[PDB]
Amino acid sequence: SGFRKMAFPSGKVEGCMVQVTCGTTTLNGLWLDDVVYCPRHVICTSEDMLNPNYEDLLIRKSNHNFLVQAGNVQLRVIGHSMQNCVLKLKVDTANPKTPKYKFVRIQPGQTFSVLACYNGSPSGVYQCAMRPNFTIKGSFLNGSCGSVGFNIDYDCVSFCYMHHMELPTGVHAGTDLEGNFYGPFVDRQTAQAAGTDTTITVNVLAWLYAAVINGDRWFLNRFTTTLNDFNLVAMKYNYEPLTQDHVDILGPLSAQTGIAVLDMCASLKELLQNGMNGRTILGSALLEDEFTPFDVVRQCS
Amino acid sequence: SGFRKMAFPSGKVEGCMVQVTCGTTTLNGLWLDDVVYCPRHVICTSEDMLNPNYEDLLIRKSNHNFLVQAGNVQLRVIGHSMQNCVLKLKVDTANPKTPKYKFVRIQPGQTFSVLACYNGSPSGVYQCAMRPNFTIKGSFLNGSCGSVGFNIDYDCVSFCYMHHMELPTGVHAGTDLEGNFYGPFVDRQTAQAAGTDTTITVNVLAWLYAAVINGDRWFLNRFTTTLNDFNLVAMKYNYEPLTQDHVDILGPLSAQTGIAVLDMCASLKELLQNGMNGRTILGSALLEDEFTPFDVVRQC
Ligand SMILES: O=C(O)c1cncc(C#CCC2CCCCC2)c1
Numbered sequence: 176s177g178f179r180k181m182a183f184p185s186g187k188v189e190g191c192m193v194q195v196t197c198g199t200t201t202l203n204g205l206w207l208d209d210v211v212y213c214p215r216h217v218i219c220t221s222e223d224m225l226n227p228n229y230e231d232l233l234i235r236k237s238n239h240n241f242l243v244q245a246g247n248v249q250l251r252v253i254g255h256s257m258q259n260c261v262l263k264l265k266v267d268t269a270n271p272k273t274p275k276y277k278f279v280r281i282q283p284g285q286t287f288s289v290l291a292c293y294n295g296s297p298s299g300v301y302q303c304a305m306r307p308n309f310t311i312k313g314s315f316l317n318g319s320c321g322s323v324g325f326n327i328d329y330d331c332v333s334f335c336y337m338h339h340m341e342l343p344t345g346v347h348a349g350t351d352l353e354g355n356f357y358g359p360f361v362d363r364q365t366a367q368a369a370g371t372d373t374t375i376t377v378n379v380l381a382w383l384y385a386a387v388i389n390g391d392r393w394f395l396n397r398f399t400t401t402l403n404d405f406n407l408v409a410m411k412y413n414y415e416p417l418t419q420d421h422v423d424i425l426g427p428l429s430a431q432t433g434i435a436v437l438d439m440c441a442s443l444k445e446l447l448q449n450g451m452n453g454r455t456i457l458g459s460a461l462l463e464d465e466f467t468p469f470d471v472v473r474q475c476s
Numbered sequence: 477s478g479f480r481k482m483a484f485p486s487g488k489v490e491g492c493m494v495q496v497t498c499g500t501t502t503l504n505g506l507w508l509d510d511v512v513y514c515p516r517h518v519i520c521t522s523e524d525m526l527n528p529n530y531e532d533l534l535i536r537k538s539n540h541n542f543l544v545q546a547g548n549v550q551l552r553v554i555g556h557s558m559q560n561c562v563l564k565l566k567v568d569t570a571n572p573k574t575p576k577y578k579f580v581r582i583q584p585g586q587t588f589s590v591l592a593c594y595n596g597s598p599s600g601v602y603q604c605a606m607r608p609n610f611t612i613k614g615s616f617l618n619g620s621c622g623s624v625g626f627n628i629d630y631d632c633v634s635f636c637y638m639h640h641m642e643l644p645t646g647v648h649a650g651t652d653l654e655g656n657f658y659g660p661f662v663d664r665q666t667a668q669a670a671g672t673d674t675t676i677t678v679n680v681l682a683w684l685y686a687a688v689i690n691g692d693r694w695f696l697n698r699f700t701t702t703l704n705d706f707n708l709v710a711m712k713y714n715y716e717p718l719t720q721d722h723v724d725i726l727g728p729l730s731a732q733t734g735i736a737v738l739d740m741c742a743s744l745k746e747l748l749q750n751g752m753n754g755r756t757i758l759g760s761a762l763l764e765d766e767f768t769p770f771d772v773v774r775q776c
């Protein structure tokens with residue numbers, strides 16, 4: 176029993192973190208076969224960050240301006256190029272610990288594990304969700320840029336995030352491994368803000384099922400509702416709309432517990448309208464929305 | 477910024493996870509150098525659960541009754557011995573992936589990472605604290621026994637926990653890697669219930685300091701308290717007594733924020749009396765007690 180925010184084992188990704196230095200800027204890179212991936216803003220100075228011309232700043236640079244350190248070894252850069260907001264440094268040596276991997280882009284609401292690193296050195300792992308506003312509530316300090324997010328599906332690591340920047344409200348923004356930003360952000364020092372966030376409704380429902388599986392039942396009631404009726408309640412409380420696709424995904428938990436999704440939505444309706452009345456659910460006073468249905472099934476079964 | 481329950485990177489421990497089988501029972505073992513450590517109840521059958529006589533069960537075993545599997549490879553057992561509640565199996569290959577490591581017995585309130593495993597394959601990593609009642613609030617399914625808890629200092633892994641069983645309230649009990657149980661528990665199916673749990677006060681204080689560091693001050697007040705008056709109040713909310721040791725431990729975080737320890741204690745007293753009136757602290761609507769003073773310094 177028990178339910179914890181759980182990250183994937185990080186060993187396969189630990190074997191790929193390197194330190195990348197360009198001038199004064201030092202940050203983290205991802206070393207897979209003979210290429211090191213890192214944020215292109217590693218080439219920027221303080222003057223450059225205000226309005227960088229990346230194609231221009233790069234063409235003036237050359238291989239030897241990139242110091243790549245894998246643990247105690249120096250890797251020598253034999254080539255460099257850009258893909259979107261990611262810098263790709265071809266190196267002389269393939270990483271012998273390259274795991275089976277894919278680059279995937281995740282959808283808001285989906286979860287992944289983050290290996291936080293400093294100076295190419297992994298320091299911690301935690302689980303988070305891509306928010307509806309495309310930010311992540313991470314925990315990062317200076318030098319975390321180029322830390323990566325990932326899922327593991329079957330010895331295969333699916334790399335989905337690379338950290339680029341912190342926003343003024345303390346949350347974080349980054350790209351997929353092809354350099355495409357999540358959300359309407361740019362890698363430049365300008366005024367950027369997270370949009371108003373919303374709650375991931377399908378994930379809250381999943382977590383309620385987790386709580387039922389773990390013996391927490393007080394919020395269940397005799398009522399059901401409809402998709403239309405509930406989605407009016409969701410809109411009112413800044414929850415994402417619940418779609419039919421969401422209901423189908425939850426299908427397994429609805430079977431395995433005997434509470435149907437609209438049955439469970441009725442509980443969530445009630446929790447939203449009346450609160451928790453001093454009680455908790457899985458040790459939380461808040462409705463938790465960073466567990467997917469899949470997260471719940473994998474951890475609970 | 478931000479503040480996350482953050483675990484240690486698990487790779488160094490993943491390279492030591494193996495599967496141990498005896499009879500029909502399979503669970504996880506920890507492979508370090510030429511020794512595999514696992515819970516000794518791997519040698520129990522159904523009939524043995526209530527009053528196992530481990531010495532009698534073990535003396536009937538030979539090396540080749542223990543199957544150890546590291547990934548695809550069978551390891552050959554060449555010796556075995558029991559130390560307290562762990563079995564130590566000597567194997568014919570030293571683990572090439574053995575990290576720098578030590579065994580440490582931790583005190584209640586200390587935190588660590590757990591690498592949950594099934595069949596010697598790691599499933600997930602999360603962060604735990606040793607509760608004051610010597611249990612841990614884990615996430616473990618059948619087959620996770622022998623999963624381990626650890627901290628990593630620089631590159632040395634300090635193993636501090638091995639999972640043995642789930643108590644009836646859904647919390648978990650285990651040993652250090654010398655096989656001594658944390659708490660009053662035994663590897664026996666008997667009525668044993670965890671002590672009433674309490675909140676780890678020194679950790680709550682450390683996390684309140686964390687909140688100040690990340691720029692949040694709404695919960696402070698203009699009062700202070702004596703240590704004894706604070707403890708008289710906090711034990712009415714089932715908080716652990718705060719000792720002078722704890723006051724000393726918090727000294728550094730006090731200096732970094734400019735808030736004396738007993739002033740933060742006064743703030744905690746008021747939080748317990750008032751709740752948070754719809755506010756949150758570092759994103760939580762409860763007082764968080766699974767971050768230690770040391771954890772806060774490391775993550776902030
Ligand atoms: O792990 C298994 O599958 C398994 C299978 N048969 C017997 C046992 C046992 C035992 C003695 C104590 C161990 C700790 C709490 C329960 C009782 C365990």
Ligand SMILES: [Mg+2]
Nearest residue numbers: 396398438441
């Ligand atoms: Mg209902």
